[PDB]
């Protein structure tokens, strides 16, 4: 078992607030394909029947 | 005339006497004209056997 590790930042009790930033861009992904359409057929009477 | 079975869509006037029949077997646009039940089709791409 493997899923138990978070990312974490510490609350600062004094005013002044702690923050993390960013410094790679790391660029670079893919995008679901969202179907749209379905494939169009008609079955044929007296002849699949 | 011959006689032979066949299915024929039936038009009736306010009389009820029959005025007009379509032969289903005779003509694509007729086997059309039975489907829908109707004497006009609405225009549409419609396979054949």
Same mark, same amino acid.
């Given at each position: 078992i493997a899923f138990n590790h978070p990312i974490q930042v510490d609350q600062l009790n004094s005013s002044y607030f702690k923050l993390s930033i960013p410094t790679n861009f790391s660029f670079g992904v893919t995008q679901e394909y969202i179907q749209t359409t379905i494939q169009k057929v008609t079955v044929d009477c007296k002849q699949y029947v | 005339y011959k006689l032979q079975p066949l299915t024929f869509l039936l038009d009736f006037s306010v009389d009820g006497y029959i005025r007009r029949a379509?032969? !289903?077997? =005779?003509?694509?646009? $007729?086997?059309?004209? !039975? $489907?829908?039940? $109707? =004497?006009?089709v609405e225009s549409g791409v419609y396979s054949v056997s």
């Open positions: - | 379509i032969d !289903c077997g =005779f003509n694509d646009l $007729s086997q059309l004209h !039975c $489907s829908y039940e $109707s =004497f006009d």
